[PDB]
Amino acid sequence: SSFKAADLQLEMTQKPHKKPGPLVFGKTFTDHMLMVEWNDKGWGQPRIQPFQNLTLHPASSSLHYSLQLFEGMKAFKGKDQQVRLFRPWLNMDRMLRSAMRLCLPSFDKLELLECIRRLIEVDKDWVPDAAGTSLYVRPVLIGNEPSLGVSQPTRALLFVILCPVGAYFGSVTPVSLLADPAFIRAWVGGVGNYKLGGNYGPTVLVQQEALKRGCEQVLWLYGPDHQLTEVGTMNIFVYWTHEDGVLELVTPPLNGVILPGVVRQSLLDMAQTWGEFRVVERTITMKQLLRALEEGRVREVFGSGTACQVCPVHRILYKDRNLHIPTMENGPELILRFQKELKEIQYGIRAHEWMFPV
Amino acid sequence: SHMASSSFKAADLQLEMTQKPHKKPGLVFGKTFTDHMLMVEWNDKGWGQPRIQPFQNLTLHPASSSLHYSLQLFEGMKAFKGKDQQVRLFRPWLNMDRMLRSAMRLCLPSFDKLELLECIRRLIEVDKDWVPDAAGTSLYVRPVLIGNEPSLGVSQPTRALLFVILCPVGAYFPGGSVTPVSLLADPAFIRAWVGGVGNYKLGGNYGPTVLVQQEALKRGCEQVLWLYGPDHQLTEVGTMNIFVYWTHEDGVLELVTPPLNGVILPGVVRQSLLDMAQTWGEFRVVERTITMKQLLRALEEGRVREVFGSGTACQVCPVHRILYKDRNLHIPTMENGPELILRFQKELKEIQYGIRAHEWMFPV
Ligand SMILES: Cc1c(C(=O)Nc2nncs2)sc2nc[nH]c(=O)c12
Ligand SMILES: Cc1c(C(=O)Nc2nncs2)sc2nc[nH]c(=O)c12
Ligand SMILES: Cc1ncc(COP(=O)(O)O)c(CN)c1O
Ligand SMILES: Cc1ncc(COP(=O)(O)O)c(CN)c1O
Ligand SMILES: [Cl-]
Ligand SMILES: [Cl-]
Ligand SMILES: [Cl-]
Ligand SMILES: [Cl-]
Ligand SMILES: [Cl-]
Ligand SMILES: [Cl-]
Numbered sequence: 221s222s223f224k225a226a227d228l229q230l231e232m233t234q235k236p237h238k239k240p241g242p243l244v245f246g247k248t249f250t251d252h253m254l255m256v257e258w259n260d261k262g263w264g265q266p267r268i269q270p271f272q273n274l275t276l277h278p279a280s281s282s283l284h285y286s287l288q289l290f291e292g293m294k295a296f297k298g299k300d301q302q303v304r305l306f307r308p309w310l311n312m313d314r315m316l317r318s319a320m321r322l323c324l325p326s327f328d329k330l331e332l333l334e335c336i337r338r339l340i341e342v343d344k345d346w347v348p349d350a351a352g353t354s355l356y357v358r359p360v361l362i363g364n365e366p367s368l369g370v371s372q373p374t375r376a377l378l379f380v381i382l383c384p385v386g387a388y389f390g391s392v393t394p395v396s397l398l399a400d401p402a403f404i405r406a407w408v409g410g411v412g413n414y415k416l417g418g419n420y421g422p423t424v425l426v427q428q429e430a431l432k433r434g435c436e437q438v439l440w441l442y443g444p445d446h447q448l449t450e451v452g453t454m455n456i457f458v459y460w461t462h463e464d465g466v467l468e469l470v471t472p473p474l475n476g477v478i479l480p481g482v483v484r485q486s487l488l489d490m491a492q493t494w495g496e497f498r499v500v501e502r503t504i505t506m507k508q509l510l511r512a513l514e515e516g517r518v519r520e521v522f523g524s525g526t527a528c529q530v531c532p533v534h535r536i537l538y539k540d541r542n543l544h545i546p547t548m549e550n551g552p553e554l555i556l557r558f559q560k561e562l563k564e565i566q567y568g569i570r571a572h573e574w575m576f577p578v
Numbered sequence: 579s580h581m582a583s584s585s586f587k588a589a590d591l592q593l594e595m596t597q598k599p600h601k602k603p604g605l606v607f608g609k610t611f612t613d614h615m616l617m618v619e620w621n622d623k624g625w626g627q628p629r630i631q632p633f634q635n636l637t638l639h640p641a642s643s644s645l646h647y648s649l650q651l652f653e654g655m656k657a658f659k660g661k662d663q664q665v666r667l668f669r670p671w672l673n674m675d676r677m678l679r680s681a682m683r684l685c686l687p688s689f690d691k692l693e694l695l696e697c698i699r700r701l702i703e704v705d706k707d708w709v710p711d712a713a714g715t716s717l718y719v720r721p722v723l724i725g726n727e728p729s730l731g732v733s734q735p736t737r738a739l740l741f742v743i744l745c746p747v748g749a750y751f752p753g754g755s756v757t758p759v760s761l762l763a764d765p766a767f768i769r770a771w772v773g774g775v776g777n778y779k780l781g782g783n784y785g786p787t788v789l790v791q792q793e794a795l796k797r798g799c800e801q802v803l804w805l806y807g808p809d810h811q812l813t814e815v816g817t818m819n820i821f822v823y824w825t826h827e828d829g830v831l832e833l834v835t836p837p838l839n840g841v842i843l844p845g846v847v848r849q850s851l852l853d854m855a856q857t858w859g860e861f862r863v864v865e866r867t868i869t870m871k872q873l874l875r876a877l878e879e880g881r882v883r884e885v886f887g888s889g890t891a892c893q894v895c896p897v898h899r900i901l902y903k904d905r906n907l908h909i910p911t912m913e914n915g916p917e918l919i920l921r922f923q924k925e926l927k928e929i930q931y932g933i934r935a936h937e938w939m940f941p942v
Contacts (some may be wrong), residue, residue: 253640274642275635278615278743279608279829283636283724286648286781287788300855323788332650358730362645363785368608368720368745370784370817372792381640383730402773409768411786418782420647420732421725428734453732515717 222328223256223263223378225335230342233270239346244387245527250343252357254335254380257312258325266335268342271381277366281373287363288417289318292526293482294354294385295340295578297347299454299569301576303321303340305357308333310482315359318414322373324361332359333576336380340578343382352387354566356526368371377406388527392555394534394548395523401539405440405450406477413476420453427452435537437523442477446506449477454523454531455484458504459554461517462537468498469554471524475503483524486574506538513543519550530558585690586618586625588697595704598633602708605748605892608718609910612705612792616697616721616742620687621879628697630704633743639728643735650781651680654890655846656716656747657702657942659709660932665702665942667719667887668930670695677721680778685734686723694721695940698742702942705744714749716930718890750892756919758898759887761803761815762794763870769804769814770841777840784817791816799901801887806841810870813841818887818895820867823918825881832862833918839867847888851922870902872941877907883914893926894919 229487233251240248249271254264281287293311297303312329319326336357347355359380363373403426405419406412412419423438430438437452448456451470457471469491472478491499512518523531532547532555547555564570596613603610615633619626643649655673659665674691698719702709709717721742725735751757767790769783770776776783787802794802801816812820813836821835833855838844855863866883876882885897896911896919911919929936 249641271640273637274640274645277727278636278722278741279720280636281785282645283651284652284720284781285723285784285788286647286650287785288648290646321789322785324794356730358641358646360640366609367606368718369606370788370791372788379640392907401796405769407768407771407774409766416785417646417648418780418785421649421780421782422733424647424649424732425683427732428685429594435864493730499729520736 221262222326222331223335225266225267225331225338227265228335228338229265229267231267231269231302235270237271237479240384243348243384245307245356246383247383248383250346250382250384252339252342254339256378258376258378260374261325262520262564263325268339274377274379276364279366279368281367282362282366284368285370286416287322287324287373289315289322289324289415290417291315291357291359291415293357295347295357295527296354296566297349299349300568301349302568303344303347303355304310304566304568304575305337307482307486307574308336308576310485314415314480315361318416319361319412321414322363322416324363325376327378335565337576337578339380340382344578346382346384346508348384350387351390354385356383356385377380392532392552394532395436396434396436396535396537397533397536398430398433398441399439399448399536401441401443401446403438403440404442407442408476410476413474413479415479423506428526433537436558439536448472448504448506448509449531450479451523453527454525455479455481455505457487457522457524458509458518459520460512463508466498468500470500470504481524483526483529486562487524487530490558490561496531510543513545518546520547520552520554522552522555523548529562530555579821583690584624584688585693586628588693588700590627591697592627592629594629594631603746605746606638607747608745610745612708612744614701614704614745615744616701618740620738620740622640622736625687625689630701635737636741638726641728641730643727644724646730647692647732648780648782649684649686649735650939651677651686651723651779652781653677653719655719655720656890657709657719658716658930659711662932663711664932665706666885667699667928667942668942669846669938669939670698672849676779676844677723680780680908683724683775683778685866686725689740694797699940699942701742702744706942708746709820710746711750713754714751716747718745718747718854718910720745745833748921756894756896756916756923758815758896759800760798760899760901761801761897762797762799763805765805765810767802767804768806772840774833774840777838777843779843797901803900805870811836812868812870812873814843815887815897817891818889819843819845821851821886821888822873822882823884827872830862832864834864834866834868836867837865845888847890847893852928853886854922854925867886874907877909880909884911884916884918885909886911886916886919894922
C-alpha cells in the first residue's frame with residue numbers, strides 16, 4: 221500500500237531559519253521536512269512539518285545494519301520564479317529499487333513525488349535563482365525496527381529534507397583523480413547499483429587518501445583490466461576517437477558496479493538524439509585510456525551527476541604515473557554543449573518534458 | 579607523551595539510575611533490553627564524559643551521516659553468569675581491538691580500549707540482575723559507534739556517538755543439544771570482496787544480506803553459505819565463520835578454516851577454536867582456502883567428518899545440508915558425533931561459566 225498526498229498534514233514552522241546572505245553544499249537546511257512513518261498497520265499519513273530532529277530507538281536497524289537508502293535531485297528556479305524538478309520520476313524509480321533491495325516498504329512513486337512537490341512549494345522562497353544555483357532534495361528511507369535481529373523490518377521512516385545550493389563552478393574548472401586499483405567501490409554480485417548509505421561510508425578514508433596524494437577525487441577502478449567505473453559520486457564519460465577510428469562518447473554499462481545516474485541517462489539520451497557521433501555503453505580500461513592518450517585520440521573526460529551536472533577531468537594519477545587529460549585543450553566542446561542544453565532545460569528557457577513543475 | 583589521553587575515561591563516568599525499572603523476562607533474540615545504557619559523545623573539543631543512563635531514545639539531526647552514508651559500526655560479545663552469581667565477559671579485549679579497527683576504517687574517533695571496557699564493565703555491574711543464569715543463557719553486549727555530522731557532505735565527521743546496549747538472551751539450542759542447519763550456496767550473492775570492508779564489523783555489510791537470507795528460506799534452507807571467487811571458496815555462513823573437520827587430500831586429519839585474506843570477519847570464537855585445537859595438539863589445525871570442488875570430492879570419498887559455523891550467537895553450529903547448483907549435499911556432521919563440535923562446546927562452556935579458571939575471562 222501507500223501513503224497519499226491527499227492525506228497530507230501541514231505543520232507550519234513557528235521558528236523559521238534565517239536565509240543565507242555563500243552557499244556551501246549540505247550544511248544549510250530549509251524550514252520544513254516531509255515525514256512518513258510505516259508499521260504493521262501500513263503507512264501513516266504523510267506530514268510536512270518543521271525541520272526537527274529524529275527520535276530513534278537505540279536498537280534501530282537503520283543504525284546497526286545500515287537499513288538505509290537515499291536520493292538526490294534538484295529543483296531549479298527560472299527568471300519568472302517558476303520552480304521545476306529535473307526528471308524526478310527517475311529518482312523515484314531508483315529509490316523504489318533501493319527499497320526493494322533492502323526489504324524496506326514499497327510506496328507509490330507519484331504520491332511521493334506529489335508530497336515532495338508540496339514540500340518544495342511550502343519552502344519555495346528557499347529556492348535560489350542566481351546562475352548555477354538550485355535546491356537540493358534529499359529523500360531518505362530507513363528501517364526502524366527496535367530489534368538486533370538481522371531481518372526485514374516491521375517499521376520504517378521516510379523523510380525528505382532540502383538544502384539551497386550555490387553555483388558549483390560560471391566557467392568549468394577541471395579536477396584531478398586518483399586511480400589506484402587497491403580501492404574498490406562495488407563488485408559484481410554486490411549493491412553498487414543501488415543508492416544505499418553503505419556504499420558511501422567506506423569511501424571517506426579513500427577520499428582522504430586521494431587528497432593526501434594531491435588529487436581531488438577518486439577514480440574507482442574494478443577488475444583485472446582496471447576498468448574505469450565511476451568518479452567520486454559521478455558517472456564517467458570519455459569522448460574520443462576509438463581504436464576502430466570512430467568518434468564516440470562512451471560510458472560504462474549498467475552491469476551491476478555502476479549507479480544508474482539520472483544525469484548519465486540524460487547525457488546518453490541527449491547525445492543519441494543529436495545523431496552526430498556514436499554513443500555507446502561499454503567498459504573502459506586503463507589500457508585503452510593510456511593508448512588513446514598516447515595516440516592523441518582523447519578529446520574530453522568528464523563526470524556526470526546532480527552535484528555539478530558535468531565536471532571536466534584534467535589529470536589522473538595512476539599509481540605513480542601522472543596522466544594529463546586534454547579535456548580543457550579541446551574546448552571542452554562536448555562538456556560546454558551538454559552544460560548549455562541542460563541549463564536551458566533546467567531553468568525553463570526551453571520548455572521540456574524532462575521538467576516537473578512545482 | 580606528556581598529554582593526557584584524548585579518550586574518554588572510566589574515571590569520569592557519570593551515573594543516572596532508572597526511575598522505573600522494567601520487569602525482567604519470566605524469548606526471541608535482540609528484542610528485550612535492560613534498564614541502562616552507556617553513552618559517550620564526541621565533537622570538536624573531543625570526547626565528553628562517559629555516562630550510564632536509563633535506556634532511552636537517540637535524538638539525531640536528520641542529516642546525520644550515520645543515516646545517509648552508513649558511518650556506523652558495532653560489536654557483539656557476551657557476558658555469562660557462573661554458579662557464584664559472578665559475571666564474566668569472554669575475551670572482550672578482542673572485541674575492543676576489532677571495534678577500534680572498524681572505527682579507523684570509517685574515519686570515526688579513536689578511543690582507549692581499556693577505558694571503554696571498564697565503562698562496559700560498570701554498565702553490566704549496574705544491570706547485573708539482568709544477566710540470566712539458566713543453562714545456555716547469557717547477556718549480549720552491543721556496542722555501537724556512529725558518525726553524527728549534521729551535513730550532507732561525504733566527509734570525516736566532526737561529531738560521533740558511542741553507545742552500548744544490553745540484551746538478555748535465552749539458550750541458542752532448546753534443551754542444550756546442538757541441532758544442525760541447512761545452507762544455500764549460490765554464487766550470485768557476494769558478501770564482500772578483496773579490498774573491501776568485509777573484514778570489519780560495519781553496519782553496511784549486513785543490510786544487503788536481508789534479501790539473500792529471504793531467498794535462502796524461500797529455497798528451503800536456513801542460512802546462507804557465502805561463496806567467493808571463480809572457484810567458489812567457502813568463506814562464511816550467515817554471520818558465522820566456517821570450519822571443516824576432515825581427512826584432507828594428503829591423508830592427514832585436520833581442522834581447517836579460511837584465512838584472513840580480507841573477505842572474512844576475524845571472529846573471536848573462530849580465533850578461540852583455532853587456539854583451543856592448537857593447544858590440544860591432537861590433529862593439524864590450519865587456515866587455508868576451502869573450495870566447493872574440495873568439499874564435493876571429500877564428501878564423495880567419505881573424508882568429511884564435521885562442518886560448522888562459529889560465532890557469538892551459538893558458539894558452534896553444526897551444518898547437515900548444503901544446497902549447491904540445485905543439488906542437496908548431505909553433510910554427515912551429526913553422524914560423526916558431532917565429536918569435535920561437542921568437545922569445543924563443552925570446553926567453551928566450562929571456561930565461560932567459570933568452571934575452569936582461564937585468562938580469556940574478564941570478571942565483572
Ligand atoms: C549534491 C552535491 C554533492 C554530493 O556529495 N552529492 C552526493 N550524492 N550522493 C552522495 S553525496 S557535493 C556537492 N557540491 C556542490 N554542489 C552540490 O550540489 C553537491
Ligand atoms: C548474537 C545473536 C545473533 C546475531 O544476529 N548476531 C549478530 N552478530 N553480528 C551481526 S548479527 S542471532 C542470535 N540468536 C540467538 N542468540 C544470540 O545470541 C544471537
Ligand atoms: C556512486 C554514484 N554514482 C553516480 C552518481 C550520479 O547520479 P545522478 O546523476 O543521479 O546524480 C551518484 C550520485 N547519485 C553516486 O552517488
Ligand atoms: C560476517 C561475520 N562473520 C563472523 C562472525 C563471528 O564473529 P564472533 O565470533 O566474533 O562473534 C560475525 C559476528 N561478529 C559476522 O558478522
Ligand atoms: Cl524523465
Ligand atoms: Cl542498474
Ligand atoms: Cl548544478
Ligand atoms: Cl583474549
Ligand atoms: Cl583481518
Ligand atoms: Cl551461547
